[PDB]
Amino acid sequence: YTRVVWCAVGPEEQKKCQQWSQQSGQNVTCATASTTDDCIVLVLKGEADALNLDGGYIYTAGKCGLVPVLAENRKSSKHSSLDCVLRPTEGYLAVAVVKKANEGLTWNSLKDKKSCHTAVDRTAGWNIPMGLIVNQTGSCAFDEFFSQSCAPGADPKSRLCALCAGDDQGLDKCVPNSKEKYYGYTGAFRCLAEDVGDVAFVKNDTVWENTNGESTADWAKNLNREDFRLLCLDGTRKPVTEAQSCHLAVAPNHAVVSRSDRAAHVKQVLLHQQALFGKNGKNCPDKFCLFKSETKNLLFNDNTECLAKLGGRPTYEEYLGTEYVTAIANLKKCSTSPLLEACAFLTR
Amino acid sequence: YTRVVWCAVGPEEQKKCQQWSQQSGQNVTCATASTTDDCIVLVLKGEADALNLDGGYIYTAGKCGLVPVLAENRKSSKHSSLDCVLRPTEGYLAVAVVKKANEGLTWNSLKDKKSCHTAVDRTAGWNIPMGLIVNQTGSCAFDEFFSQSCAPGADPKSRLCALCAGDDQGLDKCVPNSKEKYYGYTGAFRCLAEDVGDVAFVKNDTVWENTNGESTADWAKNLNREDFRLLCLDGTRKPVTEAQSCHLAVAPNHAVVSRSDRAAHVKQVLLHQQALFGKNGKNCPDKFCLFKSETKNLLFNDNTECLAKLGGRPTYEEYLGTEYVTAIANLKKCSTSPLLEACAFLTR
Numbered sequence: 001y002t003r004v005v006w007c008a009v010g011p012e013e014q015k016k017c018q019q020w021s022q023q024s025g026q027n028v029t030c031a032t033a034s035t036t037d038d039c040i041v042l043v044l045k046g047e048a049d050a051l052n053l054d055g056g057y058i059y060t061a062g063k064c065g066l067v068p069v070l071a072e073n074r075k076s077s078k079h080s081s082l083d084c085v086l087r088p089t090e091g092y093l094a095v096a097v098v099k100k101a102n103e104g105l106t107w108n109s110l111k112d113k114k115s116c117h118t119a120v121d122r123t124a125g126w127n128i129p130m131g132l133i134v135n136q137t138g139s140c141a142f143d144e145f146f147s148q149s150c151a152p153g154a155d156p157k158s159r160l161c162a163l164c165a166g167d168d169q170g171l172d173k174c175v176p177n178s179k180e181k182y183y184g185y186t187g188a189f190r191c192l193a194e195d196v197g198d199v200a201f202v203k204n205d206t207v208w209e210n211t212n213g214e215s216t217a218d219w220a221k222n223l224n225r226e227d228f229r230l231l232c233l234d235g236t237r238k239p240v241t242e243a244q245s246c247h248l249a250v251a252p253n254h255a256v257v258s259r260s261d262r263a264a265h266v267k268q269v270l271l272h273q274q275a276l277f278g279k280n281g282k283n284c285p286d287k288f289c290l291f292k293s294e295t296k297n298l299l300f301n302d303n304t305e306c307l308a309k310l311g312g313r314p315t316y317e318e319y320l321g322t323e324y325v326t327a328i329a330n331l332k333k334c335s336t337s338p339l340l341e342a343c344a345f346l347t348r
Numbered sequence: 349y350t351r352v353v354w355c356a357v358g359p360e361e362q363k364k365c366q367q368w369s370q371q372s373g374q375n376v377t378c379a380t381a382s383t384t385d386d387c388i389v390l391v392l393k394g395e396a397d398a399l400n401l402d403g404g405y406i407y408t409a410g411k412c413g414l415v416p417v418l419a420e421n422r423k424s425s426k427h428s429s430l431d432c433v434l435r436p437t438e439g440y441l442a443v444a445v446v447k448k449a450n451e452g453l454t455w456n457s458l459k460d461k462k463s464c465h466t467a468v469d470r471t472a473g474w475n476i477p478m479g480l481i482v483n484q485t486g487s488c489a490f491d492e493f494f495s496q497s498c499a500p501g502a503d504p505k506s507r508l509c510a511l512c513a514g515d516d517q518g519l520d521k522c523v524p525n526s527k528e529k530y531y532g533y534t535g536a537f538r539c540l541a542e543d544v545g546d547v548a549f550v551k552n553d554t555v556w557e558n559t560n561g562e563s564t565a566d567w568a569k570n571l572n573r574e575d576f577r578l579l580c581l582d583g584t585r586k587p588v589t590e591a592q593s594c595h596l597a598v599a600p601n602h603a604v605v606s607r608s609d610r611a612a613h614v615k616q617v618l619l620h621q622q623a624l625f626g627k628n629g630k631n632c633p634d635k636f637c638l639f640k641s642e643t644k645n646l647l648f649n650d651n652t653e654c655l656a657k658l659g660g661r662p663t664y665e666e667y668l669g670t671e672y673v674t675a676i677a678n679l680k681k682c683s684t685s686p687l688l689e690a691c692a693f694l695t696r
C-alpha cells in the first residue's frame with residue numbers, strides 16, 4: 001500500500017485525476033463515482049484512500065470514521081513570512097448573494113422566492129442558509145420554503161431540482177458533480193446571474209472571482225459588483241465589498257480526508273505532490289498543475305494556494321468547530337440520510 | 349426523522365412552539381392549524397407528530413386512531429413523596445360559575461340564559477354541561493337550551509357563536525383558539541366577568557387563578573372571588589371554596605396524543621424536553637419555560653408541574669375512562685362532527 005488512490009467526482013474530475021496520476025508516476029492513482037457521497041463510500045470500502053471535501057461532506061466523512069489530513073489554504077492579508085503549509089487556515093465567508101435590481105428582497109422576504117444551491121449537504125450552499133431558515137420558522141419543511149430551487153443531490157423530481165439544467169444535452173439533470181450546469185460555488189452563482197433564481201448560496205470569494213471580468217467564462221465576463229448585493233441576517237442589504245459585517249456564517253476550509261491508518265501516509269504523499277505540482281511547484285506549469293482545472297474547481301478549489309497542516313491532529317468535530325457541528329446536527333434532525341444511517345450502524 | 353413536529357392551534361400557540369424549536373435545537377418543530385380538529389388531522393396525515401388535548405378532543409383523536417402519551421399533572425393535594433412524572437394524576441373539577449349579583453339564577457333555572465364555554469367538544473365547556481342539559485330535559489336541542497352563547501367551535505352564523513367577540517378588530521369570531529377573546533378556560537371566565545354571559549362552564553382551578561389579583565391580566569386584577577358562586581346539581585349555589593361539594597363532574601387531565609408509530613419517540617423527546625425546560629428546568633427560566641405562556645394556557649396548561657407517564661400503553665377509552673366515554677357517546681348521538689364521521693369506521 002504505497003500508491004494513494006484518489007476518488008474523483010464525475011468525469012470532468014476524472015480527466016484531471018488521470019493527468020495527476022500519469023505525471024505523478026503511479027505514485028497517486030484514480031477511483032471515480034458519480035457523487036461525493038459515493039466517493040466517501042469508496043474510501044470506507046477501501047476502493048480509494050482520499051479526496052478533498054466541503055465542510056458539509058467532511059461532517060458525513062467524519063461521522064463515517066474518516067479523518068482530515070490537510071486543509072486547503074489561500075491568499076491571506078498578514079504574515080507572508082510564515083510558509084503556506086504552516087500559515088494558519090482562515091475559513092471562508094458563506095453569503096446570500098442577490099441582485100441590487102431585486103427591490104425589497106431582504107433575508108425575511110426570502111419566503112417562497114427562488115434559490116440556487118452549490119449542492120445538498122454543502123456548508124455555504126445548504127448547511128448555513130437552510131440551517132438558519134429551518135430554525136426561525138421552527139419548521140423542517142425547507143423542501144417547501146423556496147417556490148423553486150437548484151440543489152443537485154436533492155430528489156430529481158422535487159422542486160429543489162426544478163431550476164437544475166443538466167449538461168450539454170440536458171441529461172443527468174440535478175446530479176451533484178460538475179456535469180450539472182448550476183453545480184458548485186461557480187454553477188450556483190451562474191444560476192443567480194442568468195436570473196433562474198432570486199438568490200445564490202455560495203461564498204464571498206466566488207462573487208469577486210466571477211465579477212469585473214475576473215473570469216474568461218462567457219457568462220461572467222460582463223458582470224459588475226454593484227449589480228449584486230448581500231442579504232444580512234438583521235434584514236439590511238449591503239454591497240459585496242462589506243462581507244465582514246454582512247455574512248451568514250464562517251465556513252471551515254475544504255479539507256482532504258482519509259481512513260485513520262492511511263492519514264500520515266496520505267499527508268506525506270500530498271505535501272510532496274504539491275511541492276512537485278502545486279502553485280509554486282517545480283513542475284507547474286511545466287507538465288501538470290493540481291490547483292488549476294479551468295475555473296472548474298476540479299479535485300481542489302482553483303483559489304487554493306496550498307494544503308496547510310492541522311495543529312494537534314484534530315477530530316472532524318475539532319476541525320469544523322463545535323458551533324457548526326451543532327448547526328449541521330440540528331438541520332440533519334429534519335432529514336433521513338442513508339449513508340449517515342449506515343455509518344451509524346457500522347461505527348457504533 | 350429525529351425531530352418531533354408539535355401541532356400548535358392558532359398563532360399565539362405558534363410563537364411559543366416556534367421558540368421551543370430554537371431552544372431545543374429542532375429536537376422539536378412546529379406545524380399549525382386554525383383549530384384543534386384540523387391539528388388532529390395533521391397528526392393523522394403525519395404532517396405533524398403530536399399536541400396536548402383536553403379529554404374532549406382526545407375522544408376525537410382516539411376515534412381517529414391517535415393514542416395518548418403523557419398526562420398533564422399539577423401541584424398535588426396530597427404528599428408529593430413520589431416524583432411528579434410518577435405521581436398519579438388526580439383529575440380536575442368541571443364547574444358552573446355564576447356571579448353572586450345574579451341571584452334567582454340556579455342550575456334548575458339556567459334555561460334561556462346566556463352561556464360561556466371553553467370551546468365546543470371540550471370537557472368543562474361542553475361534554476359535561478351540555479351532556480347533562482340534554483340528559484335532564486330529554487331533548488337534543490342543546491343548540492336551543494340557551495338564549496345565546498359563546499362556544500368557540502360551534503357554527504359561526506348560529507346562536508352558540510352569538511356572544512363570541514373574536515380578536516382585537518373582532519375578526520375570526522368563535523374560531524376555537526386563543527385569538528378568540530373568550531376561547532378556552534381563561535376566555536370563558538373573562539366572558540362571565542365582563543358579564544357577556546350569566547354562566548361560564550370552566551374548572552375549579554380557573555376561578556382561583558383569575559380572582560384576588562392571582563393574575564396580572566387587567567380584567568382579572570380587580571376580580572374578587574366573593575362576587576362568584578358555583579351551581580351544583582341539587583339546585584343550590586355555593587362559594588368558590590365549596591368546589592369539591594359543588595362541581596358538575598371530574599374531568600380527566602389534558603394529555604399529549606400521537607400516532608401509534610411515533611409514541612415512544614415523542615415521549616422520550618418530551619420527558620427530556622420537560623427536564624430541560626419544565627418547572628425544575630435546567631434552562632427554565634434561563635432560556636425557555638415549557639409550562640409558562642406570554643398570554644395564557646399555550647400548548648399546555650400553566651398549572652402543569654410536569655407531564656406524567658401513563659399505565660401500560662393505554663387506549664383513548666382507558667385514559668378517559670368508561671364513564672366519561674359513554675357520557676360523550678350519548679351527547680354525540682344528537683349531533684355529528686365531520687372528523688368523527690370521516691373516522692367512524694376505524695373503531696367499528
Ligand SMILES: *[C@@H]1O[C@H](CO)[C@@H](O[C@@H]2O[C@H](CO)[C@@H](O[C@@H]3O[C@H](CO)[C@@H](O[C@H]4O[C@H](CO)[C@@H](O)[C@H](O)[C@@H]4O)[C@H](O)[C@@H]3O)[C@H](O)[C@H]2NC(C)=O)[C@H](O)[C@H]1NC(C)=O
Binds near residue numbers: 080214
Ligand atoms: C472575498 O474574496 C476575495 C478572494 O477571492 C478577496 O479579495 C482578494 O483579497 C486578497 C487579499 O489577500 C488579494 O490578494 C492580493 O495579492 C497580493 C499578492 O502579491 C497581496 O500582497 C501584496 O501586498 C503587500 C504590499 O503592499 C505585500 O503583502 C506584498 O509585497 C504584495 O505585493 C496583496 O496585498 C493582495 O492581498 C486578492 O487579489 C483579492 N482578489 C480579488 C479578485 O480582488 C476578499 O478579501 C474576500 N473578502 C473577504 C471579506 O473575505
Ligand SMILES: *[C@@H]1O[C@H](CO)[C@@H](O[C@@H]2O[C@H](CO)[C@@H](O[C@@H]3O[C@H](CO)[C@@H](O[C@H]4O[C@H](CO)[C@@H](O)[C@H](O)[C@@H]4O)[C@H](O)[C@@H]3O)[C@H](O)[C@H]2NC(C)=O)[C@H](O)[C@H]1NC(C)=O
Binds near residue numbers: 556
Ligand atoms: C380548587 O382550585 C385551586 C387551584 O386553583 C386549588 O388550590 C390550590 O391548592 C393547593 C393545596 O391543595 C395550594 O398549594 C399548596 O401549598 C403548600 C405549601 O403552602 C404545598 O406544599 C406542601 O405540600 C407538599 C407535602 O408533601 C410539599 O411540597 C411541601 O413540603 C408542603 O408541605 C402544597 O403541596 C400545595 O401545593 C395552591 O396554592 C392552591 N392554589 C391557589 C392559586 O390558591 C384547590 O385545591 C382546588 N380544589 C379542588 C378540590 O380541586
Ligand SMILES: *[C@@H]1O[C@H](CO)[C@@H](O[C@@H]2O[C@H](CO)[C@@H](O[C@@H]3O[C@H](CO)[C@@H](O)[C@H](O)[C@@H]3O)[C@H](O)[C@H]2NC(C)=O)[C@H](O)[C@H]1NC(C)=O
Binds near residue numbers: 371373620621624
Ligand atoms: C436533543 O436531543 C438529544 C437526544 O436525542 C439530547 O442529547 C443527547 O442525549 C443525552 C443527554 O440526555 C446524551 O447522553 C449522555 O452522554 C453520555 C456520554 O456519552 C452518555 O454516556 C450518557 O448516556 C448520557 O445520557 C447524548 O450524548 C446526547 N446525544 C448527542 C448525539 O449529543 C439533547 O440534550 C437534546 N437537546 C436539547 C436542546 O433538547
Ligand SMILES: *[C@@H]1O[C@H](CO)[C@@H](O[C@@H]2O[C@H](CO)[C@@H](O)[C@H](O)[C@H]2NC(C)=O)[C@H](O)[C@H]1NC(C)=O
Binds near residue numbers: 003027
Ligand atoms: C512518489 O513518486 C516519486 C516519483 O515521482 C518517488 O519519489 C522518489 O523517492 C525516492 C526514494 O523514496 C527519493 O530518493 C527520490 O528523491 C524520489 N524521486 C524523485 C525524482 O523525486 C516516490 O518513491 C513515490 N512514493 C510513493 C509512496 O509512491
Ligand SMILES: *[C@@H]1O[C@H](CO)[C@@H](O[C@@H]2O[C@H](CO)[C@@H](O)[C@H](O)[C@H]2NC(C)=O)[C@H](O)[C@H]1NC(C)=O
Binds near residue numbers: 135327330370371373
Ligand atoms: C435558532 O434561531 C434562534 C433565533 O431565530 C436563535 O436564538 C436567538 O439567539 C439570540 C442571540 O443571543 C438569543 O438571545 C435568543 O435565545 C434567540 N432570539 C430570540 C429573539 O429569542 C437560536 O440560537 C438558533 N439556534 C442555533 C443552534 O443557532
Ligand SMILES: *[C@@H]1O[C@H](CO)[C@@H](O)[C@H](O)[C@H]1NC(C)=O
Binds near residue numbers: 674678
Ligand atoms: C345521560 O344520561 C344517560 C342515561 O339516561 C347516561 O347513559 C349518560 O351517562 C348521561 N350523560 C351525562 C353527561 O350525564
Ligand SMILES: [Fe+3]
Binds near residue numbers: 122124254
Ligand atoms: Fe464549500
Ligand SMILES: [Fe+3]
Binds near residue numbers: 470602
Ligand atoms: Fe379541559
